[PDB]
């Protein structure tokens with residue numbers, strides 16, 4: 396750590412404090428996260444390189460403290476969505492961001508690496524129009540938000556799949572479009588019942604095996620499903636169809652990142668420049 400000069404505190408992650416810092420040897424500006432199976436799994440993430448994944452530059456284990464050195468980006472999507480609240484993020488920019496994030500997920504999922512905790516706070520943007528996934532793989536190795544958590548996790552599936560990240564990304568896509576969180580639960584049951592009130596209480600018809608899940612209760616109220624036309628206006632039919640597939644209850648039915656990239660919604664995808672004031 397004597398090789399890094401702290402500039403300022405930029406966040407409070409799940410595991411510890413995040414600083415903006417300067418590398419004295421290279422002149423590099425980085426993000427520094429202060430945190431044996433953990434060392435080995437984190438060392439594997441150093442190799443998981445993609446343009447839509449925030450680069451893990453180094454892992455430093457000293458005085459039984461763990462420091463992760465990451466590429467620095469100047470803003471996150473939560474701040475950008477707050478800044479764009481009055482006007483809304485333009486649809487071509489939403490589409491570009493969703494397309495890039497799906498590329499990032501398709502890459503990590505092809506290497507059997509899950510994120511598990513996608514949220515606007517860990518989606519980072521730059522002036523060029525890029526968006527990148529941060530904290531990839533750290534879940535495997537302040538109240539933690541439940542808003543983007545997949546229903547199978549809430550229902551007690553301990554051996555969940557890459558589909559959990561598609562669910563979280565569908566929640567974020569809906570929030571960019573409507574300028575409001577899709578399912579802002581403030582407890583596990585509030586989170587689950589918000590999902591059920593919008594998508595309908597799941598049953599064996601739409602999700603075979605759901606009633607045998609560890610935290611499933613036959614006493615759950617039975618709510619009818621709502622039309623996406625009511626849930627995400629003014630999203631067009633291509634976007635609503637894609638979102639529905641990203642929010643299928645059965646993780647096996649839920650669209651993969653690779654199949655989502657082929658969706659007709661991306662026929663006219665472009666890479667616009669965002670409006671950023673730093």
Ligand SMILES: O=C(Cc1ccc(-c2cccs2)cc1)Nc1cc(C2CC2)n[nH]1
Nearest residue numbers: 404405426465466467468469470471529
């Ligand atoms: O999290 C951000 C965005 C951000 C940037 C600056 C600031 C502040 C500036 C002044 C006060 S707070 C607050 C947030 N970036 C970032 C994080 C990471 C790695 C995952 C750690 N890499 N890059």
